[PDB]
Structures are given as C-alpha cells and as structure tokens.
Amino acid sequence: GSFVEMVDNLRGKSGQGYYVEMTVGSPPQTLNILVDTGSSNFAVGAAPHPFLHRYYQRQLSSTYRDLRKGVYVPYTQGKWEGELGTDLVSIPHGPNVTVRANIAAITESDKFFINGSNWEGILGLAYAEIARPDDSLEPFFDSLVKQTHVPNLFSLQLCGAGFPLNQSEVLASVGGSMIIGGIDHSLYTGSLWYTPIRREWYYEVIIVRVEINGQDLKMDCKEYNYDKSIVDSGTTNLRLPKKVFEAAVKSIKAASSTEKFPDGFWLGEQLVCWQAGTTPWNIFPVISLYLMGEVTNQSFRITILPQQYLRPVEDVATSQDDCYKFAISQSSTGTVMGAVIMEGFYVVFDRARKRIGFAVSACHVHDEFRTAAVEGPFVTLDMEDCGYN
Ligand SMILES: NC1=N[C@@H]2CCCC[C@@H]2CS1
C-alpha cells in the first residue's frame, strides 16, 4: 500500500524544523509550512519580515474570509500576533483535496521566524483544546477530516542526516515523509507498537520506565510524566522534567566517563568535536523509554542511540571535524519527545483509534554495532498510576 505522492514530501532538520509545502488562497499561494504536532493553529506569515522570502497576501485571494478577530500567541522564546480568517488550502504532495480552513495571518512576531529555517508558517496538528484563542477555532486536520474522505490518521518519518546541512543542502535534500490519511509500510522495519493517547489536547502519552544502557533510572513513574508527556515535532530536543533530567544526565555521564566534557556540553549550549569519522558512539549509552501498551498490564519500549540524542552541528571553525550538541534538556512542562527522538522512529498519529504507533525508522542513523529498537511486550503493573492529575 504505497503513497508515492506523499513519500519524501518533507524538508528540514531537527534544529530548525521539518516543513511541508502548502497552498493557500485562490489563485494558490505556495508556502513552506512547519509540521508541528505540539500545537493546534494553522498560522502563516502574512506581512513582510527580514527572515521571510514570501508571505500570505489575503488581498490577492478571492476566497479569503475575514473572521474579524485577533489572536495573540506567546511561547517561552518568541511570539506572534495575527488576524483570523478562512481560505481554501491544499497540500500539493498530499491527498488530492482542497478544504476551507482557519488561518491565522501573522502580522507581528518576535523571535519566531528564524533566519534561514525556510518555513513561512506553522501547521499545528494537535487538538482543539489547545488552539488559540480558544477551542472553537477548528484545527486544520479536523477540517480536513470533516470535509473530505481522508481517514483520521497521519504518520511522520522525520529523517536526520547524521551530519550538518547548510541552507543550500537543506533546500536540495529530502527530509522525510508526512503520510496524510495512512501508513506507508516501507518507511519502517520490525513491528508497530501502539501506546494510548491519554487525552486529546497535546498528543499526550504515558512513560512507565526509563533505562540508560539497560540500567533502570528507578524513579517513581509519575516523575516521568510530570506534568504531562507529549510527542512534539516542533521541539528539537528530548525534554525531560527537572528531576528526571538531572538523574538521566548523571547516568549518561557515568556511562560515558572515559571521556570528560565541559558543563556547557551537558547544558546543551556548547558543541563537542571529534576528528572526522572518529566520533566514539560506543562510549555513549542507549536510552530506552517504556510506554504504556494497548493491552492491560503490558508495555513496550523504544530505544534510541547517541546518533539520535547527539545533534549534528556545524563547527565554529567550519573544519573537517564531526561536531554535535547534546539534544537532551530540562523541562518545567513535562516530557517532550521532540524531533531528535522522532528521527529514530516512524510515528503514527492514529487519531481514529486514539493511539500513537512507533516503529524503527528505515531512515534512522546508526552504526554497524547497534540500531534503534521498538520491542515488547513487558509485564508492567499499575501503569494508570504513572499519569499526573
Ligand atoms: N511545538 C511547539 N510549537 C511552537 C510553535 C512552533 C515553534 C516552536 C513553538 C514552541 S514548541
């Protein structure tokens, strides 16, 4: 069951995001749009900006409808404001449909559009509960499903290159696949394992155990999900609650201790470099996250490698060295399984059956000695108790 129209429709990288081509308005205006499972607004640049090569021009669209309502969206870093409306929307390398969707026309922003990232808007794929200004603003995917025969499911294969890409190479390179309305079975190996969507707001899941090279981190499982755990393509890092983060870094440091790295490396700010080809992957441990399964008392685990959690970055001296930043960082808003984790796996957002599937990605970076894994089942008890209230 192939989806050749959708395979390879993404570009980008974990640092700047993965984006899909979309069109808005009549005649169609083409824009690059960030695929974001961590938010629920479809918002596009709609006025000139130094980091935008193009933007939505509502006065040039005959199908534009003005909702006469403003919207303000602050994040931790950065923010934007805009004006709500509706227009006709298509995904050229997607299903063959056009739908009328809500669009936030971004008229002012701060630290949102970053220099050189290539996207001109964001596609929030999560649920109405977290849509701004409120849950009456129907999200794009909800409109798509309501107005067409597209099944209520999409899947993502984000492909990390394993090495840096300049803006030129990012433009020329295939960065992965967003399969709308289905599962392309060629994008993964082994089996798909499903975890329940705890609640439809973010794509919230429940982590029940964490291992570093097989060694149980041994925290009360509520700590892993405090105050939620989500799957989020619009966040770069694996983000861990403060207490889990501190304990994981201590374990990763202990496992990797034949080499010492400065504190700024572990804080995710400073790069570390090795001579070309000599990255010592084997000194870094694998990390396993166990997730609640669909069957009572059952869990499965996903396992990533340093090739996922060390993010390739360009050198300050631009040498031939292979350089990386540590892509695990602390959070005060729960666990975020961001792009560097998703690059390990084909991830199926099965909205129709309220679950999220994971399988080893056919494009994951690994070495001759170890690969990412998705394995199960494990007998686990009182998993309900891992969720925060
Ligand atoms: N998943 C997230 N989405 C929003 C919008 C896209 C840029 C990054 C922010 C913060 S985290």
UniProtKB/Swiss-Prot annotation:
One of its GO terms (cellular component) is endoplasmic reticulum lumen. Its main location: membrane. Residues 1-389 are extracellular. The keyword Transmembrane applies. Disulfide bonds join C159-C363, C221-C386, C273-C323. Its EC number is 3.4.23.46. It is found in: Cell membrane; Golgi apparatus, trans-Golgi network; Endoplasmic reticulum; Endosome. The modification N6-acetyllysine is found at K69, K218, K222, K228, K242, K243, K250. GO terms for molecular function: amyloid-beta binding; aspartic-type endopeptidase activity; beta-aspartyl-peptidase activity; endopeptidase activity; enzyme binding; peptidase activity; protein serine/threonine kinase binding. Inhibited by RTN3 and RTN4. The active site is at D36, D232. Keywords: Acetylation, Aspartyl protease, Cell membrane, Cell projection, Cytoplasmic vesicle, Disulfide bond, Endoplasmic reticulum, Endosome, Glycoprotein, Golgi apparatus, Hydrolase, Isopeptide bond, Lipoprotein, Lysosome, Membrane, Palmitate, Phosphoprotein, Protease, Signal, Transmembrane, Transmembrane helix, Ubl conjugation, Zymogen. It catalyses: Broad endopeptidase specificity. Cleaves Glu-Val-Asn-Leu-|-Asp-Ala-Glu-Phe in the Swedish variant of Alzheimer's amyloid precursor protein. Responsible for the proteolytic processing of the amyloid precursor protein (APP). Cleaves at the N-terminus of the A-beta peptide sequence, between residues 671 and 672 of APP, leads to the generation and extracellular release of beta-cleaved soluble APP, and a corresponding cell-associated C-terminal fragment which is later released by gamma-secretase. Cleaves CHL1. Belongs to the peptidase A1 family. This is Beta-secretase 1. It comes from Homo sapiens (Human). The lineage of its organism: Eukaryota, Metazoa, Chordata, Craniata, Vertebrata. The gene is BACE1.
